[PDB]
Amino acid sequence: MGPVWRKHYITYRINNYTPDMNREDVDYAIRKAFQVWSNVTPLKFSKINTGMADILVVFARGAHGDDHAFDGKGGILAHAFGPGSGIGGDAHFDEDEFWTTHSGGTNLFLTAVHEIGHSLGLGHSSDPKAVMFPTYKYVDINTFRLSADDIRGIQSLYG
Ligand SMILES: NC(=O)[C@H](CCC(=O)O)NC(=O)[C@H](CCC(=O)O)NC(=O)[C@@H](CC(=O)NO)Cc1cc(-c2ccc(-c3cccc(Cl)c3)cc2)no1
Ligand SMILES: [Ca+2]
Ligand SMILES: [Ca+2]
Ligand SMILES: [Ca+2]
Ligand SMILES: [Zn+2]
Ligand SMILES: [Zn+2]
């Protein structure tokens, strides 16, 4: 019962890239994270490099221009705004973390799946198996799957 996008074609743009990973790996992680949600909804996501994207993906540090300042290494890893114009939908990742493609540091893909959930209108789950649970936990990314609770949540918003 949070806000939803009132359309099924949603664009995203990667505003900037963490130096922790190569650009191609950031692109891949974000694309795959969007795919997780498109797989179970009518939503389609297209990356754009120019224009006005709905969801802006940002890596930033500390106080970074909104009311949700980061806290340095550890603690909060990322945050995102629910659907709406402007900053609505945007997903922000704390550059003070060490973003990775793997089990070391903080896995970008898994964190992005969680944040994009918020960008689409989901809140937190109390189900410890849900990607929308409030605390990060590395799982085998090649066997990762949305929980039934996550699928219930997103299908209740779209479709
Ligand atoms: N406490 C911890 O274990 C870590 C430690 C961080 C560190 O020191 O490096 N920190 C967090 O988990 C923080 C705690 C923040 C707080 O409440 O104080 N959580 C986050 O930063 C969240 C913040 C948030 O909710 N943003 O919207 C970000 C977050 C949530 C996840 C997510 C990913 C996968 C899963 C998961 C769980 C079970 C199964 C599966 Cl398949 C996946 C569920 C959650 N990824 O990013
Ligand atoms: Ca936006
Ligand atoms: Ca932090
Ligand atoms: Ca970093
Ligand atoms: Zn922010
Ligand atoms: Zn969250």
**Contact status, residue 138 vs residue 107, Cβ threshold 8 Å:** yes
In the chain, which ranges are E strands?
Answer: 9-14, 44-47, 55-60, 78-80, 91-94, 99-100, 106-107
**Residue of the nearest CA to atom 42 in ligand 1?**
131
Q: How many residues does the chain have?
A: 159
d(CA 12, CA 49) in angstroms, rounded, equals 9
Which letter does DSSP use for residue 75 in this model?
S
Q: Look up residue 14 and give its two tokens.
A: 């990667």
Q: Is 24 a catalytic residue?
A: no
Q: How far is CA 121 from the centre of its chain?
A: 11
92 in contact with ligand 1, CB cutoff 6 A: no
The secondary structure of 105-144 as a DSSP string is: SEEHHHHHHHHHHHHTT----S-TTSTTSSS-----TTS-
What the block records as the tokens of 151 is 């699928």
Task: With H, G, I as helix, E, B as strand and everything else as coil, classify residue 50.
Answer: coil
CA distance 24 to 103: 18
Q: Is 88 annotated as a binding residue?
A: yes
What gap in Å lies between CA 104 and CA 14, rounded to an integer? 23
The reply to whether 102 sits in an annotated binding site is no
The resolution in Å comes to 1.2
As given in the structure block, the two tokens for residue 130 are 């849900």
Provide the pairing of β-strand 55-60 with 91-94: parallel
Tokens of 8: 């099924």
CB count in 10 Å sphere of residue 50: 6
Whether residue 72 contacts residue 81, with contact meaning beta carbons closer than 8 Å, is answered with no
Rounded distance between C-alpha atoms, residue 58 and residue 103, angstroms: 22
Work out the end-to-end distance of the chain between its first and last CA atoms, rounded to an integer number of angstroms. 14
* Ligand index nearest the alpha carbon of residue 68: 5
Q: Cβ distance 33 to 101 under 8 Å?
A: no
Q: Whose CA is nearest to atom 32 of ligand 1?
A: 136
Query: Of 33, 30, 21, 41, which Cα lies nearest the Cα of 152?
Result: 41
Superfamily (CATH H level) for 1-159: Collagenase (Catalytic Domain) (3.40.390.10)
Ligand closest to CA 107: 1
Yes or no: say if 52 and 15 are a contact pair by the CB < 8 Å rule: no
3 φ/ψ sector (left φ>0, alpha ψ -120 to 50, else beta): beta
Residue spans per domain, the chain: 1-159
